[PDB]
């Protein structure tokens, strides 16, 4: 029935998210300007992602138990999950009204063509939009949204993970917190198979991560493009 601890965890994650996600998107002004004219959107989105990586890291540090992991394991989980959590957290600005990420203003409203102008092909973009649509359809409570991002970050099967046993215990605690929350706090019919559908989204993310990595390597392949990214992005995305 959601123990004191599980309610504590949810409270920590909600505040953690509130401290790392500014719905006013005021900081977007610091990013190199978006250019909607080849790769004209790369500088702007690169900065957006670099900013987003910084936010995801801040969120992750506040995940109950994440601090108990080794420095190396913490690094491994962030490198592998960063793109996934950014895709997940972006659902908050994504709007089905026109299938775009609406970040406050027209300048900061991105659609398929903008992602296209960042160096990506439809093979990533379509399933990415598809993902956003399916996640939006779940109409998750904010409690479920933050729990899913935390569960994504603390995955024991990530390549390079060392104390896989420790990662699991941390994640299981967050999973059991989510499962129980859905039962006791998410009324039917919306709760129908909600947990299973959310886990399926993590599977979709693994697929998106894999395809993003391939197109990132093609893009970052040529120094002229790799030159337009940020140092944090270069370090995290390989």
């Amino acid at each position: 029935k959601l123990s004191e601890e599980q309610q504590h965890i949810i409270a920590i994650l909600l505040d953690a998210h509130h401290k790392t996600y500014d719905p006013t998107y005021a900081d977007f002004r610091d990013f190199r300007p978006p250019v909607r004219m080849p790769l004209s959107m790369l500088p702007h989105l690169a900065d957006l992602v670099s900013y987003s990586i910084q936010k995801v890291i801040g969120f992750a540090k506040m995940i109950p138990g994440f601090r108990d992991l080794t420095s190396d394991d913490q690094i491994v989980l962030l490198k592998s999950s960063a793109i996934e959590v950014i895709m997940l957290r972006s659902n908050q600005s994504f709007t089905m009204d026109d299938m775009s990420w609406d970040c406050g203003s027209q300048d900061y409203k991105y659609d398929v063509t903008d992602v296209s102008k960042a160096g990506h092909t439809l093979e990533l973009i379509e399933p990415l939009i598809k993902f956003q649509v399916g996640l939006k359809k779940l109409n998750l409570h904010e409690e479920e949204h933050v729990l899913l991002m935390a569960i994504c970050i603390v995955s024991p099967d990530r390549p390079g993970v060392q104390d896989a046993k420790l990662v699991e215990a941390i994640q299981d605690r967050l999973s059991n917190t989510l499962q129980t929350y859905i039962r006791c706090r998410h009324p039917p019919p919306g709760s129908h198979q909600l947990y299973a559908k959310m886990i399926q989204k993590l599977a979709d993310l693994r697929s998106l991560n894999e395809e993003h990595s391939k197109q990132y390597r093609s893009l970052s392949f040529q120094p002229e493009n790799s030159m337009k990214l940020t140092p944090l992005v270069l370090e995290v995305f390989g």
Binding site: G58, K61, L78, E235, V236
Partner: peptide, 10 residues
């Protein structure tokens, strides 16, 4: 060898 990421996690 992840300077920046590690610094941000400290």
């Amino acid at each position: 060898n992840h300077p920046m990421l590690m610094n941000l996690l400290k």
